[PDB]
CSV table of C-alpha atoms and ligand atoms in Angstrom, one decimal:
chain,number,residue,atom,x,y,z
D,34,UNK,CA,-25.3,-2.9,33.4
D,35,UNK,CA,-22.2,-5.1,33.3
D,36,UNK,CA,-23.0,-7.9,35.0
D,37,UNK,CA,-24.5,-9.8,31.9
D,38,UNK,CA,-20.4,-9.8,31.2
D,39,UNK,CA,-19.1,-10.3,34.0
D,40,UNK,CA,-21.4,-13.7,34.4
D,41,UNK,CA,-20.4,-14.7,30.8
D,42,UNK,CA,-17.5,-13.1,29.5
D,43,UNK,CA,-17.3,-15.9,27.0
D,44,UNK,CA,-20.2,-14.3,25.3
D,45,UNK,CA,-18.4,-10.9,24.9
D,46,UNK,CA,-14.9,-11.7,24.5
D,47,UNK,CA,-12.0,-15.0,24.0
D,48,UNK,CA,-11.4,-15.4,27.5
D,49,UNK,CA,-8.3,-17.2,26.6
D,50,UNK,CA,-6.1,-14.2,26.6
D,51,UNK,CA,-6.8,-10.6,26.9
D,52,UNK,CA,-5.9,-9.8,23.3
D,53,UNK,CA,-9.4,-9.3,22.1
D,54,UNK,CA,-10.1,-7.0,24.9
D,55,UNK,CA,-6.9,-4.6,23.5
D,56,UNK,CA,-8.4,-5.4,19.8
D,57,UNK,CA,-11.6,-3.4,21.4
D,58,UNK,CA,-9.5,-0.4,22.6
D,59,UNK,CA,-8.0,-0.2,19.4
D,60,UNK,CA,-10.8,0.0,17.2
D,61,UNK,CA,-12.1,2.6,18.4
D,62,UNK,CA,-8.6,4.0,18.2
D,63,UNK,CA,-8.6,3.2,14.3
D,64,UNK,CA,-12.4,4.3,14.0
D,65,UNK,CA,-11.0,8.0,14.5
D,66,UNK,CA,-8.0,7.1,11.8
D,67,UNK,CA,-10.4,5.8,9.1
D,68,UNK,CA,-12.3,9.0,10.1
D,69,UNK,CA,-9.3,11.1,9.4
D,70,UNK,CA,-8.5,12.5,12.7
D,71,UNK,CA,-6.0,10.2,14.1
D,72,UNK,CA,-2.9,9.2,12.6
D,73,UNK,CA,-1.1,8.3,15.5
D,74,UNK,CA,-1.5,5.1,17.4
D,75,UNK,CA,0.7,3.8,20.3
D,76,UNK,CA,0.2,0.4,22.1
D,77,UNK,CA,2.4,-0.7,25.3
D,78,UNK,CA,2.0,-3.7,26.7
D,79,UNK,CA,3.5,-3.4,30.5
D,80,UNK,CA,5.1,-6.0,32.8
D,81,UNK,CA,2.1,-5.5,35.2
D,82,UNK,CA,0.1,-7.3,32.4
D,83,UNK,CA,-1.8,-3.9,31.3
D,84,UNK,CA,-2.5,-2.9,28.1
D,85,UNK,CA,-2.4,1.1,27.4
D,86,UNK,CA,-4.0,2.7,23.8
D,87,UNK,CA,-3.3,5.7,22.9
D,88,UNK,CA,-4.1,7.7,20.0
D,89,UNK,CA,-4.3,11.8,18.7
D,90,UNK,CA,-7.8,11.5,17.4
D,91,UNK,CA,-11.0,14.0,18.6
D,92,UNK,CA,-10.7,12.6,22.1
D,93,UNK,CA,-14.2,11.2,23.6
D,94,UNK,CA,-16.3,13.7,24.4
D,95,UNK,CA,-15.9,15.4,28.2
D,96,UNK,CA,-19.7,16.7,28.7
D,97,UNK,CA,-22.2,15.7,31.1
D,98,UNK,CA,-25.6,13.6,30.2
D,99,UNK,CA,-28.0,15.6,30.5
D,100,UNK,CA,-30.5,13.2,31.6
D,101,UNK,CA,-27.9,10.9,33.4
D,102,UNK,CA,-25.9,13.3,35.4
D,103,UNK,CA,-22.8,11.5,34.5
D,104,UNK,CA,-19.9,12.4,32.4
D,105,UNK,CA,-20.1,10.8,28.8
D,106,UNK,CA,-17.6,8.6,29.1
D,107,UNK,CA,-18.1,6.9,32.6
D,108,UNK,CA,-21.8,5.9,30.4
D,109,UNK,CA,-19.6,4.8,27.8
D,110,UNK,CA,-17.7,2.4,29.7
D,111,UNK,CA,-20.1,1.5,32.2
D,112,UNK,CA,-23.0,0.7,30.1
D,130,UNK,CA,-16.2,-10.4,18.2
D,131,UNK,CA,-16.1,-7.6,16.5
D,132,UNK,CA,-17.8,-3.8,17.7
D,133,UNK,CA,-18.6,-5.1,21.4
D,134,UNK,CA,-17.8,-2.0,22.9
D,135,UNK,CA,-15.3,-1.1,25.5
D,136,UNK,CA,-17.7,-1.0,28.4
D,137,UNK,CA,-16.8,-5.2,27.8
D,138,UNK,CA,-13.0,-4.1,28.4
D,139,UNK,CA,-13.9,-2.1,31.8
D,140,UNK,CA,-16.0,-5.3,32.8
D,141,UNK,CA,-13.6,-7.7,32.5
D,142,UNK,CA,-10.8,-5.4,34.3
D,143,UNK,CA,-10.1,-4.7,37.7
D,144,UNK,CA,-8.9,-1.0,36.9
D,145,UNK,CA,-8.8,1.0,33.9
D,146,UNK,CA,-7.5,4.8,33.7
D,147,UNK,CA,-8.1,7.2,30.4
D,148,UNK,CA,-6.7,10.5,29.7
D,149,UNK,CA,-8.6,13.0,27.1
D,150,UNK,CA,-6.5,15.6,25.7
D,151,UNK,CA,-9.9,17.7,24.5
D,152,UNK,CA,-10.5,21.8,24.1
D,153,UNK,CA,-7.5,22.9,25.9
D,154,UNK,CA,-7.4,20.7,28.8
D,155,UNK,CA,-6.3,17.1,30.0
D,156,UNK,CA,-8.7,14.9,31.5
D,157,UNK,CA,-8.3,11.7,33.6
D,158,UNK,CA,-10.9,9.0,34.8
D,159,UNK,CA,-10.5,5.6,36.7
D,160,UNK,CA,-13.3,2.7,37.0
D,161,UNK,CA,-12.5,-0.3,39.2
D,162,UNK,CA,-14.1,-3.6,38.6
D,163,UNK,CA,-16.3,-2.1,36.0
D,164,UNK,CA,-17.5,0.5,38.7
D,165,UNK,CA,-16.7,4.4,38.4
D,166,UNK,CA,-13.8,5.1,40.6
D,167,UNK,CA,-13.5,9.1,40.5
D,168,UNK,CA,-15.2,11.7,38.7
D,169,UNK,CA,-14.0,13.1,35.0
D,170,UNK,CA,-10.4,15.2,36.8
D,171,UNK,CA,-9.6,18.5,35.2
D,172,UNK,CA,-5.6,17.3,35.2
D,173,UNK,CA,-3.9,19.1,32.5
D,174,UNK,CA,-4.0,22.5,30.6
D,175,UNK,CA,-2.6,21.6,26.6
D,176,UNK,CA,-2.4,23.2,23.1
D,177,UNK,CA,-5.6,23.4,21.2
D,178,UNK,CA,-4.6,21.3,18.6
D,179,UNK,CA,-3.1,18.6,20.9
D,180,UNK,CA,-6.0,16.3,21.2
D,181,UNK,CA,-6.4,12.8,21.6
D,182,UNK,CA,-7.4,9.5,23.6
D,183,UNK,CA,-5.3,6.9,26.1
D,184,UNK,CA,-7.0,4.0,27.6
D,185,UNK,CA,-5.0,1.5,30.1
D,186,UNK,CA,-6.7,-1.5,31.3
D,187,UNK,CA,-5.7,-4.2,33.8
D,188,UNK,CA,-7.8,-7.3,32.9
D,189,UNK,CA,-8.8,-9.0,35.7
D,190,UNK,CA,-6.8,-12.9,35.4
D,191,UNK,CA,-9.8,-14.6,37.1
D,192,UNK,CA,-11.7,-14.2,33.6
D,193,UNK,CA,-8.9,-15.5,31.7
D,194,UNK,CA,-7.0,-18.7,30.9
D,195,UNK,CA,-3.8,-16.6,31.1
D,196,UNK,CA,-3.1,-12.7,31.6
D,197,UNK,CA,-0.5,-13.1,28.8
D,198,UNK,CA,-1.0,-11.6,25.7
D,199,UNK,CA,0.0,-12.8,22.2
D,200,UNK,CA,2.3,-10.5,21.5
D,201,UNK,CA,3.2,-12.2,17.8
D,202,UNK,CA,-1.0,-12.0,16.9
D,203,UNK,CA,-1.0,-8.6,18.1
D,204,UNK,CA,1.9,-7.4,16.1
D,205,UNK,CA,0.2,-8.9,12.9
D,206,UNK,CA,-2.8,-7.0,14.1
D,207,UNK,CA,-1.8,-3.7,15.1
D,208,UNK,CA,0.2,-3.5,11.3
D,209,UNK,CA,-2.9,-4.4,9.4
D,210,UNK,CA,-4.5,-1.8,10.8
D,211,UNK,CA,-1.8,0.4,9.1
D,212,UNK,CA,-2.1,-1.3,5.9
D,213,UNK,CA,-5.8,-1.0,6.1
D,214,UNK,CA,-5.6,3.0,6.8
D,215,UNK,CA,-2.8,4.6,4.7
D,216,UNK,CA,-1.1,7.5,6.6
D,217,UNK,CA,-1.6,6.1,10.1
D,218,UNK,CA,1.7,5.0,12.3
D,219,UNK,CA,0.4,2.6,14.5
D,220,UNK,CA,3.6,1.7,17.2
D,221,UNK,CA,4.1,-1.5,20.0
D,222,UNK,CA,5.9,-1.2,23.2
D,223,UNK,CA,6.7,-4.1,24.8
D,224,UNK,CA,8.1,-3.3,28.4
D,225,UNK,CA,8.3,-7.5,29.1
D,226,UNK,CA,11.3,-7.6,26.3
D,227,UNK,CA,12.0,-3.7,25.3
D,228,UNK,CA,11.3,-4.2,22.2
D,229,UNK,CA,9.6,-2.1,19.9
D,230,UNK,CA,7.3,-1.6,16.6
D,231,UNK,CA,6.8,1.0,13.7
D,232,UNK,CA,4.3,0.6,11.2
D,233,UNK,CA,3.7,2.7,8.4
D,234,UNK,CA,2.6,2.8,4.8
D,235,UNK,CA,2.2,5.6,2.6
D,236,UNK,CA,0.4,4.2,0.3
D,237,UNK,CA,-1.4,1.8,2.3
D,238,UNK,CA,-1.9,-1.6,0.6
D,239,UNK,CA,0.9,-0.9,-2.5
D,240,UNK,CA,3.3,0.0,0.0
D,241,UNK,CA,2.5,-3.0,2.3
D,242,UNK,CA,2.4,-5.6,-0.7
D,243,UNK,CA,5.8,-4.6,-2.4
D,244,UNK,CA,7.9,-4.6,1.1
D,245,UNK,CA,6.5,-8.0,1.5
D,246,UNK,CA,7.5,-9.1,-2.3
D,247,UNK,CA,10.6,-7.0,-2.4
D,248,UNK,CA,12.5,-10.3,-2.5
D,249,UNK,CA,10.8,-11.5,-5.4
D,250,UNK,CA,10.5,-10.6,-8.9
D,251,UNK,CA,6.8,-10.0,-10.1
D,252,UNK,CA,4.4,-8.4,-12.7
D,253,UNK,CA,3.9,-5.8,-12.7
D,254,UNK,CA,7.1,-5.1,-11.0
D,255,UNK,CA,5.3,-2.1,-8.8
D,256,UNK,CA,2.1,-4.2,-9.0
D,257,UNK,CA,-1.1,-4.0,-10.2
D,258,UNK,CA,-3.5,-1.3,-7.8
D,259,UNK,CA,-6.9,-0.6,-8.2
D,260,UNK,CA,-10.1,0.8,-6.3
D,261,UNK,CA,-14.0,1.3,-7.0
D,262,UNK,CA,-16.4,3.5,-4.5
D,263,UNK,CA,-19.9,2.3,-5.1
D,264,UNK,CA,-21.0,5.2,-2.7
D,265,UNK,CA,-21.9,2.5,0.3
D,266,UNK,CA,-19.2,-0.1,-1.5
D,267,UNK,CA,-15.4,0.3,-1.7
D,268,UNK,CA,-13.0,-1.7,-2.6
D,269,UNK,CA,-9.2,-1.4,-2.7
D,270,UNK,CA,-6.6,-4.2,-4.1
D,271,UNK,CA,-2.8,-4.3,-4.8
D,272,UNK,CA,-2.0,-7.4,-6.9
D,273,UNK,CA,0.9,-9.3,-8.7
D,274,UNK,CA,2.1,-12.2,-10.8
D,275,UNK,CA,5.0,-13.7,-9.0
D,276,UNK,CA,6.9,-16.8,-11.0
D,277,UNK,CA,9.1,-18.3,-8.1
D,278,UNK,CA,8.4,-17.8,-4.3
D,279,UNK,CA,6.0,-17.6,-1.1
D,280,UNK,CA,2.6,-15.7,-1.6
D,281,UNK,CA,1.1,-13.3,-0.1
D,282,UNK,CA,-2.7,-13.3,0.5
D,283,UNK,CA,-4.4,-11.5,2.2
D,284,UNK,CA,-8.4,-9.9,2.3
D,285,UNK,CA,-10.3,-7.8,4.4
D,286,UNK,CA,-14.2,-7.0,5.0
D,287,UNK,CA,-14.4,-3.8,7.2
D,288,UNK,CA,-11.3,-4.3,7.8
D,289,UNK,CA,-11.7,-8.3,9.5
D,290,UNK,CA,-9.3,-10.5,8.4
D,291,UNK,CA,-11.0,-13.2,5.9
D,292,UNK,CA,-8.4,-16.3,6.6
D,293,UNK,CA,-10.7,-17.9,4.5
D,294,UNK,CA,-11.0,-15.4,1.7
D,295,UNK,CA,-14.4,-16.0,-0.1
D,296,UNK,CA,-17.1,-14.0,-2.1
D,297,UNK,CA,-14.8,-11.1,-2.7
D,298,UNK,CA,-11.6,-12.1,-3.2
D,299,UNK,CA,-14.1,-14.9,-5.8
D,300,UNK,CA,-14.9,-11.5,-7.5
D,301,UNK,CA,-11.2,-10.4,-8.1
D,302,UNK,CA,-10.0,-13.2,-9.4
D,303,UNK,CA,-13.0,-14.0,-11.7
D,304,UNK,CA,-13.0,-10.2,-13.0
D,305,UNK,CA,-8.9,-10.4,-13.4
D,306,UNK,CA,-9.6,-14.0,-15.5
D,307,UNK,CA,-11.9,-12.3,-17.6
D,308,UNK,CA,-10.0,-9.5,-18.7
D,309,UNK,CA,-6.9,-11.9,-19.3
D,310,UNK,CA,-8.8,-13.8,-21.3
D,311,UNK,CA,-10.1,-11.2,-23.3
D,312,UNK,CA,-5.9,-9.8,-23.5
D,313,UNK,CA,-5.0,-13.2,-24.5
D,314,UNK,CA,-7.7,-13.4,-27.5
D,315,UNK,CA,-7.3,-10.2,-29.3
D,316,UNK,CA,-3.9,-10.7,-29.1
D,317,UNK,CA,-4.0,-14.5,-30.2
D,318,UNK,CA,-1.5,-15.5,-27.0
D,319,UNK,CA,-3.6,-18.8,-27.1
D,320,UNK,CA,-2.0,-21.7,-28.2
D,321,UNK,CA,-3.3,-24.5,-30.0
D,322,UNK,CA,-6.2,-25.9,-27.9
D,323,UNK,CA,-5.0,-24.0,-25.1
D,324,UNK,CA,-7.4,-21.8,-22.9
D,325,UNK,CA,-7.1,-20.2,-19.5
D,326,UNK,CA,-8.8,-21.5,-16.2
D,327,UNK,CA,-9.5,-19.3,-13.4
D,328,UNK,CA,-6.8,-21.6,-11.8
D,329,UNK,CA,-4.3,-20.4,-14.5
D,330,UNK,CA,-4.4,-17.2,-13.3
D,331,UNK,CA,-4.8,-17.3,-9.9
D,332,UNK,CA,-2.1,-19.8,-9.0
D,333,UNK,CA,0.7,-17.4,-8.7
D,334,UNK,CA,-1.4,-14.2,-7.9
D,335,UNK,CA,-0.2,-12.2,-4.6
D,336,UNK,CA,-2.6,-9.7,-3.5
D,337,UNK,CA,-4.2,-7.6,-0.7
D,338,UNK,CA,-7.8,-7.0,-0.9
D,339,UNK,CA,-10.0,-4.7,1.5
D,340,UNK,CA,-13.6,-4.7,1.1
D,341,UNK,CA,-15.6,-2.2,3.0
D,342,UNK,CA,-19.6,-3.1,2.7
D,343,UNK,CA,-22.7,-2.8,4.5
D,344,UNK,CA,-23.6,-5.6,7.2
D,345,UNK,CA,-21.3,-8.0,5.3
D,346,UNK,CA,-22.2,-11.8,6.1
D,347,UNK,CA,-19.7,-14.3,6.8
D,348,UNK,CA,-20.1,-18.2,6.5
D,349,UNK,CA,-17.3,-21.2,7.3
D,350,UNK,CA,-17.3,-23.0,10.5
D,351,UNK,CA,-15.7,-20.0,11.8
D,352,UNK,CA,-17.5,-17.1,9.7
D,353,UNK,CA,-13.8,-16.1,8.4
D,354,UNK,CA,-15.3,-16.5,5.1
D,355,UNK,CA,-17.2,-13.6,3.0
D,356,UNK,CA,-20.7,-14.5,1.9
D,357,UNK,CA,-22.0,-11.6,0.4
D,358,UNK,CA,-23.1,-12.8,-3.3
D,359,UNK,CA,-23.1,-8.5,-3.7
D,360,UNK,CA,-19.6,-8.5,-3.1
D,361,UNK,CA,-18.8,-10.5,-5.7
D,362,UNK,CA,-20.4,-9.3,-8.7
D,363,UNK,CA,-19.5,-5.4,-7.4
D,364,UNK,CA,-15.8,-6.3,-7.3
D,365,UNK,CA,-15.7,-8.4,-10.1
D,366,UNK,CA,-16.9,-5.3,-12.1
D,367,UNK,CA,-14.2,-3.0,-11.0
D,368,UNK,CA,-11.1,-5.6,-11.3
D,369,UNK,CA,-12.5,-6.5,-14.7
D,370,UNK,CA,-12.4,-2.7,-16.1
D,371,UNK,CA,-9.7,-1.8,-14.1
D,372,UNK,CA,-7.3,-5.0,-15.5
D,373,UNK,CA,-8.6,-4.8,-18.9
D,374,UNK,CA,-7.6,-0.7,-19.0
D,375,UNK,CA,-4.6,-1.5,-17.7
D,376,UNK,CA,-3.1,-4.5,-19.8
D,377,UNK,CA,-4.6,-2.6,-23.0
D,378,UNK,CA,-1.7,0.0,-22.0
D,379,UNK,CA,1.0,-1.8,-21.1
D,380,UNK,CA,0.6,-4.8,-23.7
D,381,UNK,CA,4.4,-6.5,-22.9
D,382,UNK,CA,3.9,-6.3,-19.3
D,383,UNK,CA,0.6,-8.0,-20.2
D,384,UNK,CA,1.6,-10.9,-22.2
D,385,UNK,CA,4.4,-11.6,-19.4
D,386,UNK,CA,1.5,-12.0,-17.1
D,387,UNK,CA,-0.7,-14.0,-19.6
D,388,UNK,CA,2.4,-16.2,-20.8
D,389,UNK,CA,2.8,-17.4,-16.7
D,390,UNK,CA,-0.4,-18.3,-17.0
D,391,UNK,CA,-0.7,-19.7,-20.4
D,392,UNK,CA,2.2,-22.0,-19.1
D,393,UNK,CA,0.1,-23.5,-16.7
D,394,UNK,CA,-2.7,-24.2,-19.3
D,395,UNK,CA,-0.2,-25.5,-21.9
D,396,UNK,CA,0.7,-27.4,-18.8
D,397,UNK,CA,-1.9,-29.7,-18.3
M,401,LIG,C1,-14.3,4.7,23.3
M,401,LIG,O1,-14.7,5.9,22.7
M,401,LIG,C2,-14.8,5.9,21.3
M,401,LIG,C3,-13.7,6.7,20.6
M,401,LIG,O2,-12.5,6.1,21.1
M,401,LIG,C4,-11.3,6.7,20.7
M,401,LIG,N1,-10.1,6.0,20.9
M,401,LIG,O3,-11.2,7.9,20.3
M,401,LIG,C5,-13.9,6.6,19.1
M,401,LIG,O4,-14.0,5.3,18.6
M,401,LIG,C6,-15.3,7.4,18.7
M,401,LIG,O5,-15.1,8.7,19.2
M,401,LIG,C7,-16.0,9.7,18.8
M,401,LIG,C8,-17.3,9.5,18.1
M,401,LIG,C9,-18.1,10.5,17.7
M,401,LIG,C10,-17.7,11.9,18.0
M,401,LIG,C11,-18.5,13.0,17.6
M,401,LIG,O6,-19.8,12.9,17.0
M,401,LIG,C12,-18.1,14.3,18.0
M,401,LIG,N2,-18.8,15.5,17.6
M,401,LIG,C13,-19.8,16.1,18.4
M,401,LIG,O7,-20.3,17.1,18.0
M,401,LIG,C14,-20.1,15.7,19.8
M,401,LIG,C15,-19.7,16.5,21.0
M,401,LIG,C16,-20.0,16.1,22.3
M,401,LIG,C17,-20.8,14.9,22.5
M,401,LIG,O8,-21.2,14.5,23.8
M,401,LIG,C18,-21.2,14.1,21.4
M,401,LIG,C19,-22.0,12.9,21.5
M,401,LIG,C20,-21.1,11.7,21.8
M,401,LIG,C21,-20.9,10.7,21.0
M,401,LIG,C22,-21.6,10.5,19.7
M,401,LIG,C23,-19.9,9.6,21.4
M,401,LIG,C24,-20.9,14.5,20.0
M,401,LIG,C25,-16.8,14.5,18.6
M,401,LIG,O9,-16.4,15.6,18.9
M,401,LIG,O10,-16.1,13.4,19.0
M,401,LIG,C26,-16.5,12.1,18.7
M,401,LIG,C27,-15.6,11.1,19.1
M,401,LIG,C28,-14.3,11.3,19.8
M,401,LIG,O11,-16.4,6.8,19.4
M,401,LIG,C29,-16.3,6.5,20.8
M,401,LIG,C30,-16.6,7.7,21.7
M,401,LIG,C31,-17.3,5.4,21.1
């Protein structure tokens, strides 16, 4: 049932805006990106104060429960991160999908949480078009305000293109007209360098690695940048870490350790001089994505990455991975080891 939600919505969602309730919709948008069937995700925001998802993924299912009677989806959505989007139908006074799946259209409404037609046979379309739209109407009375953030959502919706190279995830807002493209190739390289393309760094194209641990994988672009804003940024499943914490601790201590390994064959070191994880780290831009098993946060907000696993498992892969890379590019290298021998030799 929904009522649980509808008595405490604080529990399932921030009931100061509806943005959360659209950060539902589009996960599961992005589950089907990450699962390499979507690569197309469009997000309107409407006058009417509705929010619409659509995507080109599988499209949910259009069967009938067997035991239940009921089309899949109406159980779905009639029965924070991962909360489900049943919590996005409770909190709304009407919600209408379209599934573009085997050839035909389908449409379904709910009001008030509550199944408001049956799963409509609206649409005959190409095999391969496929795909999922939600639109829900959150209902004000749960809310501070009906307003969304339109700013937090934009940062949002382009991490989740970042996070998921390939994917062109796209904002409509009807309120102003204006509109948003996101895509990267490459994913976090891509992202990185249009963000630092103001700025000269080393390596100039960055530093990119990644490590698959078959349950752990971890991605990174990274950069020394001598004058100018940073940018840093890390993820767990893709969640935003504000705070940073146990993984980002394990690239920084496994790029420090290769550095210092660079700087002592190669006798950078000067007289009583050696590098502190500080050193290196101070002008370091990076992305960092993380994708783990059950990760644990910690922080008086949990925006912080516990997992002591994380740490040791990325620290392994930067510290290869840098130490490979600075072996083969040895000027490049002691332009990143003189910035930060200069903060050593400064101090
Ligand atoms: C809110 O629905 C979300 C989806 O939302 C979006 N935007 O696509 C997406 O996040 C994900 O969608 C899935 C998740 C799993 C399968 C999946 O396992 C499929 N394969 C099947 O063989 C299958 C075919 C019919 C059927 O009733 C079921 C069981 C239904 C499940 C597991 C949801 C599975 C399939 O065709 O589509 C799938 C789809 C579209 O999971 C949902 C349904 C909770």
């Amino acid at each position: 049932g929904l009522d649980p939600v509808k008595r405490r919505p604080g529990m399932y969602t921030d009931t100061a805006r509806p943005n959360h309730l659209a950060q539902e919709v589009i996960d599961n948008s992005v589950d089907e990106a990450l699962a390499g069937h979507a690569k197309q995700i469009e997000v309107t925001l409407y006058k009417d104060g509705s929010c619409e998802v659509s995507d080109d993924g599988r499209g949910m299912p259009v069967d009938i429960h067997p035991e239940e009677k009921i089309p899949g989806v109406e159980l779905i959505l009639t029965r924070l991160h991962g909360v489900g989007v049943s919590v996005v139908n409770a909190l709304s006074t009407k919600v209408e999908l379209f599934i573009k799946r085997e050839g035909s259209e389908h449409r379904m409404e709910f009001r008030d949480g509550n199944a408001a037609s049956k799963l409509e046979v609206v649409g005959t379309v190409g095999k391969k078009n496929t795909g999922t739209r939600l639109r829900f109407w959150a209902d004000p009375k749960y809310f501070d305000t009906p307003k969304f953030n339109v700013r937090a959502l934009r940062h949002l919706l382009r991490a989740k293109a970042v996070l998921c190279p390939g994917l062109t995830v796209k904002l409509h807002d009807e309120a102003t007209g204006e509109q948003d493209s996101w895509y990267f190739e490459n994913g976090l390289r891509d992202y990185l360098k249009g963000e630092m393309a103001e700025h000269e760094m080393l390596p100039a194209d960055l530093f990119v690695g990644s490590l698959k641990k078959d349950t752990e994988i971890v991605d990174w672009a990274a950069g020394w940048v001598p004058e100018g804003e940073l940018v840093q940024e890390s993820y767990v499943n893709l969640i935003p870490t504000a705070q940073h914490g146990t993984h980002v601790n394990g690239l920084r201590s496994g790029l420090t350790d290769a550095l210092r390994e660079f700087c002592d064959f190669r006798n950078l070191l000067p007289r009583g001089v050696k590098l502190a994880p500080e050193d290196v780290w101070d002008r370091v831009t990076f992305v960092l994505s993380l994708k783990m098993t059950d990760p644990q946060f910690s922080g008086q907000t949990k925006e912080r990455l516990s997992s002591r696993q994380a740490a040791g498992f990325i620290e392994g892969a930067a510290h290869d991975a840098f130490s490979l890379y600075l072996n083969q590019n040895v000027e490049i290298g002691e332009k990143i080891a003189q910035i930060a021998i200069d903060r050593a030799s400064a101090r």
